[PDB]
Design a binder for this molecule. Structure first.
Ligand SMILES: [Mn+2]
Ligand SMILES: [Mn+2]
Ligand SMILES: [Mn+2]
Lengths: 302, 308, 306
């Protein structure tokens, strides 16, 4: 697709991971993905202008081009390579979106970057772990999946495709609270672990200490995992969800050797609640989640 | 009132609870009640178009007419009979009086209950709580009734408040108030005088909201839910918002702990569309929240017991 | 500034604390502060029309003039001193120094008359002038500030908190709910030995498990609206998601211990940035109106125990 040309050209022209990085996690690469969402997708730009200090005492540094210096160990910098928006003049197809995502992710991954996808409908999850599986067929992938919906009742869902192709060692679904009959069948069938909202709440959300894991984790976050009061900008809201702090806390509990990728999705500008100054509540919430997701890519361990 | 005629006509034509329902909970009947609220009342319609799968792994099935088949125990269906809006718009530009709302509500509740349905009222100002437990008390004079009332306000300082009328008439066995956080001096007096149990916001928060496991009770339970029991961040569409309230999930959790042999009825009220916070697609935040609360309230009607 | 003339004149005429208040907490005096915020500042007026009953079974009584009778039971008198700025007494915007001098003056006056001053609105700068007004009148008293904020707010040398720390007017600072801590913030924390309770930490230990904030000295309570999550208080200049709920804040406030309250500053609210219901009531005004009320309660009921 010619719409992805300027982006793809800049991404494969990205300076590879330097030798100064050896034995260290990262660096992180960030791009805007917009499949299944309106053409105007302002989440990436909103994050890039957001404050850079994290919950945990570290600081993001954002760069438009390389080389990406590996910061000194006493420096709490976390470099992020901004690769910009995938689209820059008619709505591209899902397959075209799939190809652009697969290509960009593959390129970044083989250059030693941790790909972070922001926006879209969740289809990036499929293509990003496929980009990883092609490059590293030996590595077993596990997905931590934050969502109001199990999203395995549709055979075309990114998560279902991956389980059908057998590209996933395991899946952990968090915050589900609209579980259909079909969902329950696929759950038992593929032996998925799940932490549904009501059960996660009655145990004490703050009492969640670890999501134990030994394999590289992909982090997939549907914005609708958050309560509609914190993240209203979603197509299929389910009330009674996580607070932004709840989600941050659980994210911080994710363990593993490395992060294969991150997809933050489900955000639709047309559905947000807006302040009088036209800043959307969901954009505020997700910018924070994206920042602490980036932190986790730099700090994860078993 | 002629404004309720088409509704009332449909209601008394409703198929009675069949023999296949013998010694089972339910079924549930659902109608739109609009007293004290603007004429445009979208909550029932919004709920009707909402997803059917619940927290706990069951699924609502909605029907415009009977017969309502009792599902096999292995299928987790929960039939709901949609009786529609009590007030028929375009049947007159008249606002029914407090008495007309009361009489209409009283009659529909009586009809549904006698036909073996658990009535669920959606909308209005809280007055349906009065007419619904009176309809039950008429039909079942021997039954003791307890009400679990979710509200930011005790709402018992006004002698004309629905809950105070019930106590003054001695129709209630007991009252459990949950989420109160604007308690007047008069509320305190009426509290001690009628020996109400209550669980104020600060108290249950400091105890740990998830530590609430049960509300012990042996009598048939009426569930009354003021939307303003929720924090204005989750349910802004309320006439008298009081900050520092329940989240939607907090409310869901406490609801799930309600015990009893059966539900006599449910009233979910206090939602005013004129006061909501709207998304850019003009969907109300409070409608989102309440639609979820209504679904899980229905689930409680089908699965309530007296244990743990 | 002549903009504060009508206000200051009234404050100076305020009836001093009567003898019936001897060795009792209060009374409380309330005023609207508007430094750094838009000219239209409705938070004071919104609070004044809000319900009077509190979480804990007490009831605010609002009075426009003295004398303030000391009640035997559960009344909590508040003296409304109104807006510091008088609209239509000039279309001119006061300066920071003018805001500071006016606030210093009003606080001095109210404090010397035995009132606990409560400032509503503005940008946090009232915290500077209020504890300085107290420090002038009572140089011997040690002051501690309990500071609710998404930001430590000590990376700017000009910040109200750092000016106090550099002038050595503070015995200690307890910061609650920070979740955007810069490199500079950490340095100043270490240097001035500030105690802090960041969002992630108090959340992970259980927000409801916080029973009290131990303290022996008079407390100044400074509350930035942005300490609350943007979903509860969206009307803030620098939102940081993952904050307190209104009830979380109320619970933690209730835990504050001490012999007395030297003052309260509730700030950070900008009406131009609020989320509004369809009837044009702002979400943040709803939250803060409650925060202000239970804050007033704490000034009347604070004790050093546990
Ligand atoms: Mn979803
Ligand atoms: Mn109420
Ligand atoms: Mn702040």
């Amino acid at each position: 697709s010619h719409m992805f040309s300027k982006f793809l050209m800049n991404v494969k022209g990205v300076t590879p991971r330097g030798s100064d990085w050896a034995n260290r996690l990262g660096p992180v690469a960030l791009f805007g993905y917009g499949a299944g969402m309106p053409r105007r997708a302002p989440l990436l730009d909103f994050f890039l202008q957001s404050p850079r200090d994290c919950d945990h005492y570290a600081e993001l540094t954002i760069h438009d081009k390389g080389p990406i210096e590996c910061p000194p160990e006493t420096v709490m910098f976390m470099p992020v390579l901004n690769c910009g928006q995938m689209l820059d003049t008619e709505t591209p197809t899902s397959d075209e979106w799939y190809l652009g995502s697969l290509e960009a992710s593959t390129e970044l991954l083989e250059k030693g970057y941790v790909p972070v996808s922001v926006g879209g409908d969740g289809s990036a999850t499929l293509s990003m772990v496929e980009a990883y599986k092609r490059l590293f067929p030996s590595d077993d992938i596990v997905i931590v999946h934050f969502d109001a919906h199990p999203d395995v009742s549709d055979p075309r869902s990114p998560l279902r495709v991956l389980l059908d192709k057998g590209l996933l060692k395991g899946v952990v679904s968090v915050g589900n609270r609209q579980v259909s009959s079909e969902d329950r069948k696929v759950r038992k069938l593929h032996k998925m672990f799940y932490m549904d909202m009501h059960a996660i709440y009655s145990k004490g959300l703050f009492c969640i200490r670890d999501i134990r894991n030994d394999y590289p984790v992909f982090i997939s976050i549907d914005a609708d995992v958050l309560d509609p009061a914190f993240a209203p900008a979603v197509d299929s809201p389910v009330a009674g969800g996580l607070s932004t702090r709840d989600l941050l806390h659980i994210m911080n509990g994710i363990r593993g050797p490395k992060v294969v990728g991150i997809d933050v999705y489900g955000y639709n500008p047309d559905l947000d609640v807006y302040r009088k100054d036209n800043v959307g509540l969901t954009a505020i919430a997700l910018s924070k989640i994206i920042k602490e997701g980036i932190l986790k890519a730099y700090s994860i361990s078993t």
